[PDB]
Each structure stands twice: as structure tokens, then as C-alpha cells.
Amino acid sequence: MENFQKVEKIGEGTYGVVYKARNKLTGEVVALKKIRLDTETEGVPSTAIREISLLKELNHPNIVKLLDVIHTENKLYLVFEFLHQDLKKFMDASALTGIPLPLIKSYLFQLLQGLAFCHSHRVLHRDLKPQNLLINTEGAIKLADFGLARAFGVPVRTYTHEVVTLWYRAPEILLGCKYYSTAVDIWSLGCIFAEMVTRRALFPGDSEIDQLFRIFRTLGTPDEVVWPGVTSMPDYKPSFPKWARQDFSKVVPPLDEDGRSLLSQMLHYDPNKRISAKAALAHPFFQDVTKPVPHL
Amino acid sequence: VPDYHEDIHTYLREMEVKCKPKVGYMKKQPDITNSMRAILVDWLVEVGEEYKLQNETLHLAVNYIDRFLSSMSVLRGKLQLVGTAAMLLASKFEEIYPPEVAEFVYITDDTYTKKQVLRMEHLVLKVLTFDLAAPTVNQFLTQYFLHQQPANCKVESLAMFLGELSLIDADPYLKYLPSVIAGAAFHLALYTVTGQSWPESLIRKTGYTLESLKPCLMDLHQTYLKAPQHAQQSIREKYKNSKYHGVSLLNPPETLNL
Ligand SMILES: Cc1nc(C)c(-c2ccnc(N)n2)s1
């Protein structure tokens, strides 16, 4: 609005266009998310209603800051703090060289703090993926895009047909469970950890069943010993092929013993045993964490 | 089993204080009445049944309605537009796929237009300043239900039923926090079904003794007793379903031993 001068388009999110903008009175640079408001159609999109109600409650250093909401007759603008870029872009730029291990560990540590903060305030993010993870030039990383986030004061029911990502989806959701839990966010963060480490997606599936099967070929086909209940899950089939668990040392070679132990904990099949963000933060992998800056 | 059952419960306790409507508000409304509120809320129960909405959506819509009427004067001929915009927003917040706006026009018998419903959406978001994630009886009940030994379907359905009845009567129920109303329903549902009482694990967690719940429990028991006679019957009819173990057919205890 009148005190902002648009500088350039930076992205689309859920509901979309994001512009870099400058506050002409204070100098602050901001990211402005403009929702295109059809007032004969459906009104304010549920993605926006959720992202604003939930973001307004979450004040934390590793969650993106919503500075303001400018809400007029035909337009709705979200004003966010501006961050340099998204982890996906940084990983693409860092392919070939790879992101340094100390930076990986700092990003992981910071993300787990943002999520532990989300979960202890009954917010499930539900869509963690590198495009939703924003970095600055001073070494910080923040969770962004709360469009698909849900309050879990009451359990969150699953979407029959699910327009969340496929690559970062937890196996309990793939096997048809009834509710989400906080485990689904740990499972996605585990995928991203391994992706920074190897410089490629861990489980790049092409459909629901393909995706289940990539998970199965790396972690082993689950059974009731590992995951009590699995075989009575709605989308579970006794005809699933029986693959063996792979050594973590083949899966993520660069990683030391402590990182292999935490990753195998974030990728537990049974969402009841999968580590919580709060507990991950105690893990010895973090004892020697620093705050290196990205070469951007 | 979460590491945050505690943290979420404490946080919900904080938030419910901040999302509280003004208890006095109906008497500052020059054109509307506890009795019209009651008709509106009862109608929303039916809309929730007809469109197969979760119970949480109904509780959130009521919270939105009460907070909006705590700051804005509304004329009887517009109160249903408030209710419809609140139900739409609660459906957007809570439902996987909310009914289309056209459907919310149709439920009023075309008494408002689509553009009216949408402009009331905008105005409700503004008055509520986008704070939509409000704690509800339903949410406190859901947490409380973990402390059952052992878990009892009828107990849970009848606690839900009593928690919904309290939405209908501003009457007294605006006086109590959702954690206390949930406290009273859980106890009264337990007692009715099994003869047990508000469990000590819940006493320690909530810091609510059975005695501190007494004022709210006397209101709820009278409501339960009087339910079959109440001018509004939608929650009753709804809770005779087998999905809900028919609990609203059960016979309330004539006394509470309190
Ligand atoms: C949703 C969002 N999508 C983007 C790209 C957001 C954002 C927030 C702050 N800074 C930047 N570059 N982007 S918030």
C-alpha cells in the first residue's frame, strides 16, 4: 500500500505472488505476499486464514515473522520480514561443492528449534520442504509458508486426496492413517537433512506407491516387529515386496556416527517411536554445533 | 504420548483467557437476545449435521459469533448473516474442504446474497483481527479424554453432548472458561455413565478440584435435566444417532452427590 514501493517479484506460495518491497518511510525491506481477492468467488482462501491466524501466534527466531496484514476491500497483503533465499535454491547453487557439514548441522539445529516451538503451541506445519525453508546471509534459517498448517488442539484428520508434497511425506500417511501427528514433520525434516548431506532427494517418488516403495527399499519393508499395527493399515498390502534395511553408511556416507543415529531416529517407521523435535535437540550430534554463514 | 501434551495444555489455558467474549454483552445489544442467540446456534448445529461438519467447526463458529457481538451492534435481521459468515470461516479454518460459499447462501433460504456473505466474512476477520485459533470445550475435552481408565465410548459421547448443550445458552455459560465447562461435562458424563468422578490426575493437571467445578456443574446438571423440554432440540436429535451411542437417550442422574 501507499508506503511500500514494489522492487521485484520473488516467488509464488500457497495463494501466491511474493514481492520484494521497500518501506518508503522507514527503509525496511519486506516480502509482500499479495492474495488476489475474488469477492464474488470464495472470498479469503483458507490457506491465508490459517497462515495469518497461526503465524500471528508464533514469535520465534526460526519462524518467519509476519510484520503486518493490510486488509482492504479488494486486496489482502501479508507483510513478512525479508529473507535472502530459500534452501532449495541454496542447495542447487551448492551442488557440486555440497553444503558444508557444519552449516548442515546448524540449519538442522535451528529448524528443530522452530518446529519444537510450533508443536509446543499445537501447530503442525505439514508441508516442510526446502522451498519453504528461508535463509539469510547471517546464517539463520526459518520455517515459512504456513498455508497448509493446522492447529491440533483436536487431532487433524487426513486428506483423502492430498495436495501436500510427495517426496517429504511420512509412510503412515502413505499407508492411509486417519490422523496426522507431529511425527510427520520430523519425518520430513529427516528427508531434508539427508538431502543436504547427499545433495539429492532421499525418496524422490513419482506416485503414492512409488514413494512407499522407495522408502521401503532404503529402510526395509516394515512389519509388525518394527511397527505394530502396520499390517492392519488401510493401504497396506501383504503383497508388498520384502526388502532389507540398508546400512545407513551406504545411505548417507559423509555423516558421522552421531548423525547416522539421529537420522535413523527421525526416520523411524512407527510415528509413536519417531523422535520428537524436543528430544532431537538433546542429541549428541549437536554438542559441537556452531553458526557458520552461507557463501551466498 | 507427546512431549508437549503438557506444553499444549498450558498454552491452551493461556489462549482461552485471551479469546474470551465479554460476558455482559447481550444486555448491551439493543436489538438481539439470548433467545435469538439460542435459535441461531441451534440452527448451526443442523447445518453442521446437514453438511457433515466436524464438531470442532461448530464450536469455533460460536466462539467467533460471541466475540463479534461483544464489539459490534447487530440488528435481528442481520444476526443470521453474522452466523453464516462465522460458520464459513470456521469451516475454512478447521475443515479439509469447506462447503462452497454458494452453499452457505442456500442454507439461509437465499435471504442474503453471496456478496453479502463475503463482505461479512471480511468484516468478521477484521473485528476478530484474524485470531481464529481459539480454544474450545471440544479441545479441552479431547485432552481430558486421555486421563480415562479405562476409555469409555459412552463417557466421551455424553461429555461431547453436554459440552455442545452449553453452546446454546449464553444465559449462564458465557461465565465459564471452556476448560471449566469441559471439566464439568467430563465429570458429569463419567458420573452418569459409571458413577466415577473427576480423576486425580486431572485435578493435578488442571489445578481444578471437584469443588472448584461445582458452580459450573450445577448449571450443567440442570441443563442436562431440562434438555428434553428446552425450546431447542437439534443437539438432542443429533446425539440419538448410533454414531454417538445414543447417549442423549440415557437418563440423567437426579442428584450429583456434591
Ligand atoms: C509464503 C512465502 N513465500 C516466500 C517466498 C516468503 C518470503 C518471506 C520473506 N522473505 C522472502 N524472500 N520470502 S513467505
Coordinates of N, CA and C in Angstrom, one line a residue, chain A residues 15-201:
Chain A
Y15 N -1.4 -19.5 -2.6 CA -2.1 -18.3 -2.8 C -1.4 -17.1 -3.5
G16 N -0.1 -16.9 -3.1 CA 0.9 -16.5 -4.1 C 1.2 -15.0 -4.3
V17 N 1.7 -14.7 -5.5 CA 2.8 -13.7 -5.7 C 3.4 -13.1 -4.4
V18 N 4.7 -13.3 -4.3 CA 5.6 -12.6 -3.3 C 6.5 -11.6 -4.0
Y19 N 6.4 -10.3 -3.5 CA 7.3 -9.3 -4.0 C 8.3 -8.8 -2.9
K20 N 9.5 -8.5 -3.4 CA 10.4 -7.8 -2.5 C 9.9 -6.4 -2.5
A21 N 9.8 -5.7 -1.3 CA 9.3 -4.4 -1.3 C 10.1 -3.5 -0.3
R22 N 10.0 -2.2 -0.5 CA 10.7 -1.3 0.4 C 9.7 -0.3 1.1
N23 N 9.8 -0.2 2.4 CA 9.0 0.7 3.2 C 9.6 2.1 3.0
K24 N 8.9 3.0 2.3 CA 9.5 4.2 1.8 C 9.7 5.2 3.0
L25 N 9.1 4.9 4.1 CA 9.2 5.8 5.3 C 10.3 5.4 6.2
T26 N 10.5 4.1 6.4 CA 11.5 3.6 7.4 C 12.8 3.0 6.8
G27 N 12.7 2.8 5.5 CA 13.7 2.0 4.8 C 13.7 0.5 4.8
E28 N 12.8 -0.1 5.6 CA 12.8 -1.6 5.9 C 12.5 -2.3 4.5
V29 N 13.3 -3.3 4.2 CA 13.0 -4.2 3.1 C 12.1 -5.4 3.6
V30 N 11.0 -5.6 2.9 CA 10.0 -6.7 3.3 C 9.7 -7.6 2.2
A31 N 9.1 -8.7 2.4 CA 8.5 -9.6 1.4 C 7.0 -9.4 1.6
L32 N 6.3 -8.9 0.5 CA 4.9 -8.7 0.5 C 4.2 -9.9 -0.3
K33 N 3.4 -10.6 0.4 CA 2.5 -11.7 -0.2 C 1.2 -11.1 -0.5
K34 N 0.8 -11.0 -1.7 CA -0.4 -10.4 -2.2 C -1.3 -11.6 -2.5
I35 N -2.5 -11.7 -1.8 CA -3.6 -12.5 -2.2 C -4.5 -11.8 -3.1
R36 N -4.9 -12.4 -4.2 CA -5.8 -11.9 -5.2 C -7.2 -12.2 -4.9
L37 N -7.9 -11.2 -4.3 CA -9.2 -11.4 -3.6 C -10.4 -11.3 -4.6
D38 N -10.9 -12.4 -5.1 CA -12.2 -12.5 -5.7 C -13.4 -12.6 -4.7
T39 N -14.2 -11.5 -4.8 CA -15.2 -11.2 -3.8 C -16.6 -11.6 -4.4
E40 N -16.6 -12.3 -5.5 CA -17.8 -13.0 -5.9 C -17.6 -14.5 -5.9
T41 N -16.3 -14.9 -5.9 CA -16.0 -16.3 -5.7 C -16.0 -16.9 -4.3
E42 N -14.9 -17.1 -3.7 CA -14.9 -17.9 -2.4 C -14.4 -17.0 -1.2
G43 N -14.1 -15.8 -1.5 CA -13.6 -14.9 -0.5 C -12.1 -15.2 -0.1
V44 N -11.8 -14.9 1.1 CA -10.4 -15.2 1.6 C -10.1 -16.7 1.6
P45 N -9.0 -17.2 1.0 CA -8.7 -18.6 0.9 C -8.3 -19.1 2.3
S46 N -8.7 -20.4 2.5 CA -8.4 -21.0 3.7 C -6.8 -21.0 4.0
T47 N -6.0 -21.1 2.9 CA -4.6 -21.1 3.2 C -4.2 -19.8 3.9
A48 N -4.9 -18.7 3.5 CA -4.5 -17.4 4.1 C -5.0 -17.3 5.5
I49 N -6.2 -17.8 5.7 CA -6.8 -17.7 7.0 C -5.9 -18.4 8.1
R50 N -5.5 -19.6 7.7 CA -4.6 -20.4 8.6 C -3.2 -19.8 8.8
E51 N -2.5 -19.4 7.8 CA -1.2 -18.8 7.8 C -1.2 -17.6 8.7
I52 N -2.2 -16.7 8.6 CA -2.2 -15.5 9.4 C -2.6 -15.8 10.8
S53 N -3.7 -16.6 11.1 CA -4.0 -16.9 12.5 C -2.9 -17.5 13.2
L54 N -2.2 -18.4 12.5 CA -1.2 -19.2 13.2 C 0.1 -18.5 13.3
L55 N 0.5 -17.8 12.3 CA 1.8 -17.0 12.3 C 1.7 -15.9 13.3
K56 N 0.5 -15.3 13.5 CA 0.3 -14.2 14.4 C 0.6 -14.6 15.9
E57 N 0.4 -15.9 16.2 CA 0.7 -16.6 17.5 C 2.1 -17.1 17.6
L58 N 2.9 -17.3 16.6 CA 4.2 -17.9 16.7 C 5.4 -16.8 16.6
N59 N 5.9 -16.4 17.7 CA 7.0 -15.5 17.7 C 8.3 -16.2 18.0
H60 N 9.1 -16.5 17.0 CA 10.3 -17.3 17.4 C 11.4 -17.0 16.4
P61 N 12.7 -17.0 16.8 CA 13.7 -16.7 15.8 C 13.8 -17.6 14.6
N62 N 13.4 -18.9 14.6 CA 13.4 -19.7 13.4 C 12.1 -19.9 12.8
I63 N 11.1 -19.0 13.0 CA 9.9 -19.0 12.2 C 9.8 -17.6 11.6
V64 N 9.4 -17.6 10.3 CA 9.3 -16.3 9.6 C 8.3 -15.4 10.3
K65 N 8.7 -14.1 10.4 CA 7.9 -13.1 11.1 C 6.9 -12.4 10.2
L66 N 5.7 -12.4 10.6 CA 4.6 -11.7 9.9 C 4.6 -10.3 10.5
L67 N 4.9 -9.3 9.8 CA 5.0 -8.0 10.4 C 3.6 -7.3 10.4
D68 N 2.8 -7.5 9.4 CA 1.6 -6.7 9.3 C 0.6 -7.4 8.3
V69 N -0.6 -7.1 8.3 CA -1.6 -7.6 7.4 C -2.4 -6.4 7.0
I70 N -2.5 -6.1 5.7 CA -3.1 -4.9 5.1 C -4.3 -5.4 4.3
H71 N -5.5 -5.1 4.7 CA -6.7 -5.9 4.5 C -7.6 -4.9 4.0
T72 N -7.7 -4.7 2.7 CA -8.7 -3.7 2.2 C -9.8 -4.4 1.4
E73 N -10.7 -3.6 0.8 CA -11.9 -4.0 0.1 C -11.6 -5.1 -0.9
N74 N -10.7 -4.9 -1.9 CA -10.3 -5.9 -2.9 C -9.0 -6.6 -2.8
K75 N -8.1 -6.2 -1.8 CA -6.8 -6.8 -1.7 C -6.4 -7.2 -0.3
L76 N -5.8 -8.3 -0.2 CA -5.2 -8.7 1.1 C -3.7 -8.9 1.0
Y77 N -2.9 -8.1 1.8 CA -1.4 -8.3 1.7 C -0.9 -8.7 3.0
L78 N 0.0 -9.8 3.0 CA 0.8 -10.1 4.1 C 2.2 -9.5 4.0
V79 N 2.6 -8.8 5.1 CA 3.9 -8.2 5.1 C 4.8 -9.1 6.0
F80 N 5.9 -9.7 5.4 CA 6.8 -10.6 6.1 C 8.1 -9.9 6.2
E81 N 8.9 -10.2 7.2 CA 10.4 -10.0 7.2 C 11.0 -10.5 5.9
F82 N 12.0 -9.9 5.3 CA 12.5 -10.3 4.1 C 13.7 -11.3 4.3
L83 N 13.8 -12.4 3.6 CA 15.0 -13.3 3.8 C 15.6 -13.6 2.4
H84 N 16.9 -13.8 2.3 CA 17.6 -13.7 1.1 C 17.1 -14.8 0.1
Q85 N 17.1 -16.0 0.6 CA 16.6 -17.1 -0.3 C 16.2 -18.3 0.4
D86 N 15.7 -19.3 -0.4 CA 15.1 -20.5 0.1 C 16.2 -21.6 0.0
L87 N 16.2 -22.6 0.9 CA 17.1 -23.7 0.9 C 17.2 -24.4 -0.4
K88 N 16.1 -24.6 -1.1 CA 16.2 -25.3 -2.4 C 17.2 -24.6 -3.4
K89 N 17.1 -23.3 -3.5 CA 17.9 -22.5 -4.4 C 19.4 -22.7 -3.8
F90 N 19.5 -22.7 -2.5 CA 20.9 -22.7 -2.0 C 21.5 -24.1 -2.3
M91 N 20.8 -25.1 -2.1 CA 21.2 -26.5 -2.4 C 21.6 -26.6 -3.9
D92 N 20.7 -26.2 -4.8 CA 21.1 -26.1 -6.2 C 22.4 -25.3 -6.5
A93 N 22.5 -24.2 -5.9 CA 23.8 -23.4 -6.0 C 25.0 -24.1 -5.4
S94 N 24.7 -25.1 -4.5 CA 25.8 -25.6 -3.7 C 26.0 -27.1 -4.2
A95 N 25.4 -27.4 -5.4 CA 25.6 -28.7 -5.9 C 27.0 -28.8 -6.4
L96 N 27.6 -30.0 -6.4 CA 28.9 -30.0 -6.9 C 30.0 -29.8 -5.8
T97 N 29.9 -28.7 -5.1 CA 30.7 -28.5 -3.9 C 30.0 -29.2 -2.7
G98 N 28.7 -29.1 -2.6 CA 27.9 -29.6 -1.4 C 27.9 -28.5 -0.3
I99 N 26.8 -28.4 0.5 CA 26.7 -27.6 1.6 C 27.7 -28.2 2.7
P100 N 28.6 -27.3 3.3 CA 29.5 -27.8 4.4 C 28.7 -28.4 5.5
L101 N 29.3 -29.5 6.1 CA 28.7 -30.2 7.2 C 28.4 -29.3 8.4
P102 N 29.3 -28.4 8.8 CA 28.9 -27.5 10.0 C 27.7 -26.7 9.7
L103 N 27.5 -26.3 8.4 CA 26.3 -25.5 8.1 C 25.0 -26.4 8.1
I104 N 25.1 -27.6 7.5 CA 24.0 -28.5 7.6 C 23.5 -28.7 9.1
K105 N 24.5 -28.8 10.0 CA 24.1 -29.1 11.3 C 23.5 -27.9 12.0
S106 N 24.0 -26.7 11.7 CA 23.4 -25.5 12.2 C 22.0 -25.3 11.7
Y107 N 21.7 -25.6 10.4 CA 20.4 -25.5 9.8 C 19.5 -26.5 10.5
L108 N 20.0 -27.7 10.6 CA 19.1 -28.7 11.3 C 18.8 -28.3 12.7
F109 N 19.7 -27.8 13.4 CA 19.5 -27.4 14.8 C 18.5 -26.3 14.9
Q110 N 18.7 -25.3 14.0 CA 17.7 -24.2 14.0 C 16.3 -24.7 13.6
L111 N 16.2 -25.5 12.6 CA 14.9 -26.0 12.2 C 14.2 -26.7 13.3
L112 N 14.9 -27.5 14.1 CA 14.3 -28.4 15.1 C 13.9 -27.4 16.2
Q113 N 14.6 -26.3 16.4 CA 14.1 -25.4 17.4 C 12.8 -24.7 16.9
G114 N 12.7 -24.3 15.6 CA 11.4 -23.7 15.2 C 10.3 -24.7 15.3
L115 N 10.6 -26.0 14.9 CA 9.5 -26.9 14.9 C 9.0 -27.3 16.4
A116 N 10.0 -27.4 17.3 CA 9.7 -27.7 18.7 C 8.8 -26.6 19.1
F117 N 9.0 -25.4 18.7 CA 8.2 -24.2 19.0 C 6.8 -24.3 18.4
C118 N 6.7 -24.7 17.2 CA 5.4 -25.0 16.6 C 4.6 -26.0 17.3
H119 N 5.2 -27.1 17.6 CA 4.5 -28.3 18.2 C 4.1 -28.0 19.6
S120 N 4.9 -27.3 20.4 CA 4.5 -27.0 21.7 C 3.4 -25.9 21.8
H121 N 3.1 -25.3 20.7 CA 1.9 -24.4 20.5 C 0.9 -25.0 19.6
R122 N 0.8 -26.3 19.6 CA -0.2 -27.0 18.8 C -0.4 -26.6 17.4
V123 N 0.7 -26.4 16.7 CA 0.7 -26.1 15.3 C 1.5 -27.2 14.6
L124 N 0.9 -27.8 13.6 CA 1.6 -28.8 12.7 C 1.8 -28.1 11.4
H125 N 3.0 -28.1 10.8 CA 3.3 -27.3 9.7 C 2.9 -28.1 8.5
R126 N 3.1 -29.4 8.5 CA 2.5 -30.3 7.4 C 3.2 -30.2 6.0
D127 N 3.9 -29.2 5.7 CA 4.4 -29.1 4.4 C 5.9 -28.7 4.4
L128 N 6.8 -29.3 5.2 CA 8.2 -28.9 5.2 C 8.9 -29.4 4.0
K129 N 9.5 -28.5 3.3 CA 10.3 -28.9 2.1 C 11.2 -27.8 1.8
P130 N 12.3 -28.0 1.1 CA 13.4 -27.0 1.1 C 12.9 -25.7 0.5
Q131 N 11.9 -25.6 -0.3 CA 11.4 -24.3 -0.8 C 10.7 -23.4 0.2
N132 N 10.3 -24.1 1.3 CA 9.6 -23.4 2.4 C 10.5 -23.0 3.5
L133 N 11.8 -23.2 3.3 CA 12.8 -23.0 4.4 C 13.7 -21.9 3.9
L134 N 13.6 -20.7 4.6 CA 14.3 -19.5 4.1 C 15.6 -19.2 4.8
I135 N 16.6 -18.8 4.1 CA 17.9 -18.4 4.7 C 18.2 -17.0 4.5
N136 N 19.0 -16.5 5.5 CA 19.6 -15.2 5.4 C 21.1 -15.2 5.3
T137 N 21.8 -14.1 5.1 CA 23.2 -14.1 4.9 C 24.0 -14.2 6.2
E138 N 23.3 -14.2 7.3 CA 23.9 -14.2 8.6 C 23.8 -15.5 9.3
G139 N 23.4 -16.6 8.5 CA 23.4 -17.9 9.0 C 22.1 -18.5 9.5
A140 N 21.1 -17.7 9.6 CA 19.8 -18.1 10.1 C 19.0 -18.9 9.1
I141 N 18.2 -19.8 9.6 CA 17.2 -20.4 8.7 C 15.9 -20.5 9.4
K142 N 14.8 -20.2 8.7 CA 13.4 -20.1 9.2 C 12.4 -20.9 8.5
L143 N 11.4 -21.5 9.2 CA 10.2 -22.1 8.6 C 9.3 -21.0 8.0
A144 N 8.9 -21.2 6.8 CA 8.0 -20.3 6.2 C 6.8 -21.1 5.5
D145 N 5.9 -20.3 5.0 CA 4.7 -20.8 4.3 C 3.8 -21.7 5.2
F146 N 3.0 -21.1 6.1 CA 2.1 -21.8 7.0 C 0.7 -22.0 6.3
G147 N 0.6 -21.8 5.0 CA -0.6 -22.0 4.3 C -1.3 -23.3 4.6
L148 N -0.6 -24.4 4.8 CA -1.2 -25.8 5.0 C -1.1 -26.2 6.4
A149 N -0.7 -25.3 7.3 CA -0.6 -25.6 8.7 C -2.0 -25.7 9.4
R150 N -2.0 -26.6 10.4 CA -3.3 -26.8 11.1 C -3.0 -26.8 12.6
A151 N -3.9 -26.2 13.4 CA -4.0 -26.3 14.8 C -4.4 -27.7 15.2
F152 N -3.7 -28.4 16.1 CA -4.0 -29.7 16.6 C -4.5 -29.8 18.0
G153 N -5.1 -28.8 18.5 CA -5.9 -28.9 19.8 C -6.8 -30.1 19.8
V154 N -7.4 -30.4 18.6 CA -8.1 -31.6 18.3 C -7.3 -32.3 17.2
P155 N -7.3 -33.7 17.1 CA -6.4 -34.3 16.1 C -6.8 -33.9 14.7
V156 N -5.8 -33.7 13.8 CA -6.0 -33.3 12.5 C -6.3 -34.5 11.5
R157 N -7.5 -34.6 10.9 CA -7.9 -35.7 10.1 C -7.1 -35.7 8.7
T158 N -6.8 -36.8 8.2 CA -6.1 -36.7 6.9 C -7.0 -36.5 5.7
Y159 N -6.4 -35.8 4.7 CA -6.9 -35.6 3.4 C -6.9 -36.9 2.6
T160 N -8.1 -37.5 2.3 CA -8.2 -38.5 1.3 C -7.3 -38.3 0.1
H161 N -7.5 -37.2 -0.7 CA -6.7 -36.8 -1.8 C -5.8 -35.6 -1.3
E162 N -4.5 -35.8 -1.3 CA -3.6 -35.0 -0.5 C -2.8 -34.2 -1.5
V163 N -2.9 -32.9 -1.4 CA -2.1 -32.0 -2.2 C -0.9 -31.4 -1.4
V164 N -0.4 -32.2 -0.5 CA 0.9 -31.9 0.1 C 2.0 -32.5 -0.7
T165 N 3.2 -32.2 -0.5 CA 4.3 -32.8 -1.3 C 4.3 -34.3 -1.2
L166 N 4.9 -35.0 -2.2 CA 5.1 -36.4 -2.2 C 6.5 -36.9 -1.6
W167 N 7.6 -36.3 -2.1 CA 8.9 -36.6 -1.6 C 9.1 -36.6 0.0
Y168 N 8.4 -35.7 0.7 CA 8.7 -35.5 2.1 C 7.5 -36.1 3.0
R169 N 6.7 -36.9 2.3 CA 5.6 -37.5 3.0 C 5.9 -38.8 3.8
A170 N 5.4 -38.8 5.1 CA 5.7 -39.9 6.0 C 4.9 -41.1 5.6
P171 N 5.5 -42.3 5.9 CA 4.9 -43.6 5.5 C 3.5 -43.8 6.2
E172 N 3.3 -43.3 7.4 CA 2.0 -43.5 8.0 C 0.8 -42.9 7.1
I173 N 1.1 -41.7 6.5 CA 0.2 -41.0 5.7 C 0.0 -41.8 4.3
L174 N 1.1 -42.2 3.8 CA 1.0 -43.1 2.6 C 0.2 -44.4 2.9
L175 N 0.2 -44.9 4.1 CA -0.4 -46.2 4.3 C -1.8 -46.1 4.8
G176 N -2.2 -44.8 4.7 CA -3.6 -44.4 4.9 C -4.0 -44.1 6.3
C177 N -3.2 -43.6 7.2 CA -3.8 -43.3 8.5 C -4.8 -42.1 8.5
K178 N -5.6 -42.1 9.6 CA -6.7 -41.3 9.8 C -6.3 -39.9 10.3
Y179 N -5.3 -39.8 11.1 CA -4.8 -38.5 11.6 C -3.4 -38.2 11.3
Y180 N -3.0 -37.0 11.1 CA -1.7 -36.5 11.3 C -1.2 -36.6 12.7
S181 N 0.1 -36.6 12.9 CA 0.7 -36.2 14.2 C 1.9 -35.4 14.0
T182 N 2.5 -34.9 15.1 CA 3.8 -34.1 14.9 C 4.8 -35.0 14.3
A183 N 4.7 -36.3 14.4 CA 5.8 -37.1 13.7 C 5.9 -36.8 12.2
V184 N 4.9 -36.3 11.5 CA 5.0 -36.2 10.1 C 6.0 -35.1 9.8
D185 N 6.1 -34.1 10.7 CA 7.1 -33.0 10.5 C 8.5 -33.5 10.8
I186 N 8.7 -34.4 11.7 CA 10.0 -34.9 12.0 C 10.5 -35.7 10.8
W187 N 9.6 -36.5 10.2 CA 9.9 -37.4 9.1 C 10.4 -36.5 7.9
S188 N 9.7 -35.4 7.6 CA 10.1 -34.5 6.5 C 11.5 -33.9 6.8
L189 N 11.7 -33.4 8.0 CA 13.0 -32.8 8.4 C 14.1 -33.8 8.2
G190 N 13.9 -35.1 8.6 CA 14.8 -36.1 8.3 C 15.1 -36.3 6.8
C191 N 14.1 -36.3 5.9 CA 14.4 -36.3 4.5 C 15.3 -35.1 3.9
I192 N 15.1 -33.9 4.5 CA 15.8 -32.7 4.1 C 17.2 -32.8 4.7
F193 N 17.4 -33.1 5.9 CA 18.8 -33.4 6.5 C 19.6 -34.3 5.5
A194 N 19.1 -35.5 5.1 CA 19.7 -36.4 4.2 C 19.9 -35.8 2.8
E195 N 19.0 -35.0 2.4 CA 19.1 -34.3 1.1 C 20.2 -33.3 1.1
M196 N 20.4 -32.5 2.1 CA 21.5 -31.5 2.2 C 22.8 -32.4 2.2
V197 N 22.8 -33.5 3.0 CA 24.0 -34.3 3.1 C 24.5 -34.9 1.8
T198 N 23.6 -35.6 1.1 CA 23.9 -36.2 -0.2 C 23.7 -35.3 -1.4
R199 N 23.2 -34.1 -1.3 CA 22.9 -33.3 -2.4 C 21.9 -33.9 -3.4
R200 N 21.2 -35.0 -3.0 CA 20.0 -35.4 -3.7 C 18.8 -35.8 -2.9
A201 N 17.6 -35.6 -3.3 CA 16.4 -36.0 -2.5 C 16.6 -37.5 -2.1

